[PDB]
Every structure is written in C-alpha cells, then in structure tokens.
Amino acid sequence: SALHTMPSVIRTLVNIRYVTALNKAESNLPSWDEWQTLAENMEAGLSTQ
Amino acid sequence: LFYSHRYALSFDDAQVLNGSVINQYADDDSVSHFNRLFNTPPLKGKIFE
C-alpha cells in the first residue's frame, strides 16, 4: 500500500536475486518482456503530473 | 446540462454519464475524450483498447 503497488508485484521485486552471473545463490534476473510487464504493473498506480 | 449545472462536469463527461459512450473521434484538433482519459500519457506502448 505504501508503494501503491500490488502484493504480487512486491513479491516479484523481493524475489529479484540480483546476482548477475554467480558469486551468490543464482541469477534470478527476469527476461526482457517480464521486466517490461513488471515495470508496467509497479508504475500503473501513480498520479498524472 | 443538469449534471454540468450541479456536479460541474464537462459536456462529454455528463454525456457519457447519462448513458452515451466515450467519443474516441473528437474534433481531432486537440485531445479527444478517450485519449484524455487513457493517454495522459501512454505508459510505454501505444494504446490498444
């Protein structure tokens, strides 16, 4: 609610293992269209200005 | 006119509210009603509604 975004969107943001070719668990970076759709979903709840 | 007098609504808004549809093809020299409602601004891609 604070971010004005859907809970599954929050879950997707948290699930981002930003590891970028190892040194940690795994690279959970979404695909290009998944990134685009996630950005649309998280941005859809803003104002006009 | 009645809605414009009390609720202070635009002509297109009150026309749609009383039972008409949103005019996608306005006089076209400026923004139409459909574009004013869902294209201010388009998020990333062109509108397809």
UniProtKB/TrEMBL annotation, chain A:
Q: Identify the stretch annotated as signal peptide in this record.
A: none
At the top level, the lineage of the source is Bacteria
Can you name this protein? XptA2 protein
Q: Which gene encodes it?
A: xptA2
Give from-to of the shown chain within the full protein. 881 to 929 of 2538
